[PDB]
Design a protein around this ligand. Structure first.
Ligand SMILES: [Ca+2]
Ligand SMILES: [Ca+2]
Ligand code: NA
Ligand code: NA
Lengths: 665, 667
């Protein structure tokens, strides 16, 4: 069959699957089909029989609304994605959800849809390949050698995150990253010129990319030459400017916004079949077309050759090969749990009053030698977030390093780190001031949705940061993280809770962990062995009374000391009081009900939450008959000690709120 | 005095005020002082005695950590910012907070600090000037004519929002926007080349800006020539690449990251005075330096001339002049309240089961003729968010229009709109799918912090959007907005609540209002005149029983219909039930204790919340002895009606959960 006929198989499956679902996006799949045919059939290194092959090329659809493009490619090339799944596009619990989802579907590398994040993920995958190659390859043994290919459209280009990640990709000279821009002139509002006029090629040259202009995206020869040129440029990421017609093949909807995001309609599909010369019924693909698209034979041969290379590497470099396998599988070192517990116990036995941002740095220092998979960084705040340890080595200085200076790029940093975790081989950590989780907020959500392990180190967590004032002082950010599905959030009260939280984060297998860390020094709490072991349960009894409590303080982070001081005053008066430290609400909620009852007995309704964050969160644990010593406003610019007084974080106020509560009970 | 001596007054006040506070950022003020001296003394059109003069130039410090730069300028030029306030830099309730804040300090145009947002605000101010000039200027009467000047640094340049807003500024040919880039080679991690290597000039040329390269930022003549060149280019925004030395004057800390974000230290300040030749003690400025910096006499003359121009305009164009004054003051038309109430009453009397996104469009259509100040837009989703009305006209097509195609730029859109509201003359509305509030999230917060009027139209609010799936289906986003200080969030249940929420938003002068709008059609509920008036109280009794309820449903948005159906089933079985519609938790919380008790009586603990959003929010109103029919997970890609079934938003499940709750209460 001709290359155009092979590409038209994508067009037919895509328009037909959208039509059957009465939902979805036919235009971009039809516009990019010729580019995909060249890339996938002539260049992409992959094995449909093992989508987890460590050295496969990675493909990313940043314009993820065009999901039928990737489903068509996976089906046609022989992945485990049968025609019946394509006939179930956008239907409940199918393998073909409306935007592609990692884990749902063999061969999907990332969950995309939110524009701009796919290219960010691809930058992270390319950083991962470059770093892993530098760490593991040896003379005569290049066991890491693969490309990262991304498709992206006008929406990704307009989004600010594209600027963040493509700027950094240029700095890092990511010569195995090759992006294809679907330059079709159309977005949802219509002809893009009314709102998007960049000289995109000049912009990308300003980032240090190699740019190939004026590619005919409907001409296989033009596309193939451009890909060859990009592969020959080994010291710059490449952008291929592909002129395409959205909805290519449709006489009445090609080149129109109408083709972007709704079914073409039955009559228009019939006219499209006529224009394309496509003679097959919906969901019919002839054997000749499958024979030319199938990648099982070539893919198995390529993976088998790689397996033989890896076997030879393992003979010459046995310890390195074992580390490669462990890291690509995402497994932890067998002795990590014991060694981390030993560190935690040492901290409990050797008290220190330090900021939890410093306790975080100390945990990185302790775990660094044990976790060579760390690939950490900060968004231009290394000396404030405290993300460097003695073994940190910046990858812009040494490609085999373990640290990224991300610059002032919080959203891009977080979505790059999602790509790093998706690649395999690494455990990424990222960092900024907590307020700027808001810049990165959807990438944080995407880490949780994709079940990815990433530790997110958020410092300067409250009015305790002092004079920088209300634009920087978090109030409501932690509450939002706490109600995000599959997110773990820890607000440690001292250096011991900080190390437990770090351990919890690195040991998650199925989602991310945010650490909520103080600028100011935090006193260490004394703990029994039982309390020490129960920190990891997220909430535990820190101070207690004999018998059933009359009054329970629930406190987190920097406010535990205040709650303890109020507890001591009331205990001396003869109140049966308790303090619960709640470093992680999510870990607490996951405990068995007997444990939760032992900490927060259902019969004890006189509960006072204490936290320098938005009060409204705490109704979850105090209900309608408790009290909350929290924030209800933005902060103020002043020294931290005066702010804590101004906003009611005083022993007198906490005691008064508890006594007022005890009248009612 | 020489120009350098005048600039050194900024350096001295800045380093000394940071030192006294033992906190703050001396480096950028010291690095940009010569640029500021030229801009403010030779070009800026302003009147210190009236910071609200409608036709003043607007200045924005996007690198807002350098707050002592603007405080020095405002003090030296004669604004109401006494030296005592500079001595109280970063102290509680001073007029000199660590990052500048609009409202409390005379002459501060915007609250900045979060990097990139200042340049976005400046783009909005420049859009506002261009649009207001096109709407109001007449032959012989150019009553709107002013520049927007912005300072920005490497952090702003690295942030994605700078790409969004500077790209759009290029498309819109904002020839009165002039930005100065503090090109000093330093960020917090050190020398920027390890993480920031863009050819920034080439990047901005790709956006359609006029770029002036290689300006000596410590040479007044070079800076002045560059500003003159940028002012001569009337068809492009301009970027002035100013090579500066951070901490200029400090022998040991100039050019170092150490000068960025901590006091220089007393010993280093002494050496800096010696290098700069600045003899005056901390907080001492001689009368002759004030005489050269003061702008009161020039500012009075400029504003007086403008007032004469405006008086001549008002004689020739009296209705237009009255509209200009009204709009610049942020006042609403005198008949708006009555006309909007008439519209709301008509909707209550004429049911229509339509999506609240469509009810929103209908409110824009009804309000549009009454609010010529609207400057609305969507982030490339006009046909989905339903932000166009019959009178919309895109400003890229006609500069006197009222609509902005923002492109796929949610964060930039929202921070541009903050600039629009800060400028005066307009009432901005912005729009995207609700999920992508997360892209714009800090700009929403900044609107609330700055007490700005902006209506944020967020459509496709739940699993009700269907097949696009979990990356697009909001779950926890509304709860995040609800816990934001000074935010107003409305999730209307029908076309009537939608119109009430729109009226509330446009009339809310002291903060923003988000509308949480459905893709799918919403049943209209029956209301008495009192219930109709009670929508605006945020939470109200929609269905009731005689005597104390044994069950209260609390529902919002698309789930009110489900809660009412469950109420009807239970009522028919003899259960005493009530339904509360809670379109706005923030408005409800602002009602007095007696009203809140009347709606959610403390005696009734069997409360069931119903909302297709994150469940944990609702403990605030249901307590520990209730039930929540909510989401606890991400969504799924499927037809919406199947999602509502799968996630428990069915009458059978709501009734079962309510009966299970009552059974637990009984035993
Ligand atoms: Ca497009
Ligand atoms: Ca800088
Ligand atoms: Na290359
Ligand atoms: Na100009």
């Amino acid at each position: 069959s001709s290359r155009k006929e092979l590409a038209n198989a994508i067009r037919a499956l895509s328009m037909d699957a959208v039509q059957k679902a009465k939902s979805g996006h036919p235009g971009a799949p039809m516009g990019m089909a010729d580019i995909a045919e060249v890339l996938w059939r002539d260049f992409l290194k992959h094995n449909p029989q093992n989508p987890s092959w460590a050295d496969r090329d990675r493909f990313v659809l940043s314009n993820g609304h065009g999901s039928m493009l990737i489903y068509s490619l996976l089906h046609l090339t022989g992945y485990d994605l049968p025609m019946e799944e394509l006939k179930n596009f956008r239907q409940l619990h199918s393998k073909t959800p409306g935007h592609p989802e990692v884990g749902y579907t063999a061969g999907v590398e990332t969950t995309t849809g939110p524009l701009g994040q796919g290219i960010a993920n691809a930058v992270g995958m390319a950083i991962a390949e470059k770093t892993l190659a530098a760490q593991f390859n040896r003379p005569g043994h290049d066991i890491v050698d693969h490309y990262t290919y991304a498709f992206m459209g006008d929406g990704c280009m307009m989004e600010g995150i594209s600027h963040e990640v493509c700027s950094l990709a240029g700095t890092l000279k990511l010569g195995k990253l090759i992006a294809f821009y679907d330059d079709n002139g159309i977005s949802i509002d219509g002809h893009v010129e009314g709102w998007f006029t960049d000289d995109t090629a000049m912009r990308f040259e300003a980032y240090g990319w190699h740019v190939i202009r004026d590619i005919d995206g409907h001409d296989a020869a033009s596309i193939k030459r451009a890909v060859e040129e990009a592969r020959a440029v080994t010291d710059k990421p490449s952008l291929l400017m592909c002129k395409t017609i959205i909805g290519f093949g449709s006489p009445n909807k090609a080149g129109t916004h109408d083709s972007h995001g709704a079914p073409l309609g039955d009559a228009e599909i019939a006219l499209t079949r006529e224009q394309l010369g496509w003679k097959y019924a919906p969901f019919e693909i002839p054997s000749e077309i499958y024979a030319q698209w199938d990648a099982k034979e070539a893919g198995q041969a390529k993976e088998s050759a790689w397996n033989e290379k890896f076997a030879a590497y393992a003979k010459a470099y046995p310890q390195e090969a074992a580390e490669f396998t462990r890291r690509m599988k995402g497994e932890m070192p067998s002795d990590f749990d014991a060694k981390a517990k030993e560190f935690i116990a040492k901290l409990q036995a050797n008290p220190a009053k330090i900021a939890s941002r410093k306790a975080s740095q100390n945990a990185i220092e302790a775990f660094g030698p044990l976790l060579p998979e760390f690939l950490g960084g900060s968004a231009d705040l290394a000396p404030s977030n405290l993300t460097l340890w003695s073994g940190s080595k910046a990858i812009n200085e040494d490609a085999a390093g373990n640290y990224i200076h991300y610059g002032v790029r919080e959203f891009g940093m977080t979505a790059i780190a999602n790509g790093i975790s998706l690649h395999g081989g690494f455990l990424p950590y990222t960092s900024t001031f907590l307020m700027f989780v808001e810049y990165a907020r959807n990438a944080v959500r995407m880490a949780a949705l994709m079940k990815q392990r990433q530790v997110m180190v958020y410092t300067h967590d409250s009015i305790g940061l002092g004079e920088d004032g209300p634009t920087h002082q978090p109030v409501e950010q932690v509450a939002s993280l706490r109600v995000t599905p599959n997110m773990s959030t820890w607000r440690p009260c001292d250096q011991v809770e900080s190390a437990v939280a770090w351990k919890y984060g690195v040991e998650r297998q199925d989602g991310p962990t945010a650490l909520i860390l103080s600028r100011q020094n935090l006193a260490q709490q004394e703990r029994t062995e039982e309390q020490l072991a129960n920190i990891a349960r997220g909430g535990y009894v820190l101070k207690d009374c004999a018998g059933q409590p009359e009054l329970i303080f629930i406190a987190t982070g920097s406010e535990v000391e205040l709650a303890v001081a109020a507890y001591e005053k009331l205990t001396a008066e003869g109140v049966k009081a308790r303090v619960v430290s709640m470093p992680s609400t999510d870990a607490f909620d996951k405990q068995d009900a007997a444990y939760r009852e032992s900490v927060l007995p259902k019969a004890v309704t006189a509960r006072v939450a204490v936290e320098a964050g938005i009060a409204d969160y705490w109704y979850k644990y105090v209900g309608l008959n408790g009290a909350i010593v929290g924030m209800t406003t933005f902060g103020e610019s002043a020294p931290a000690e005066l702010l804590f007084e101004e906003f009611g974080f005083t022993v007198d106020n906490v005691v008064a709120k508890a006594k007022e509560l005890l009248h009612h009970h």
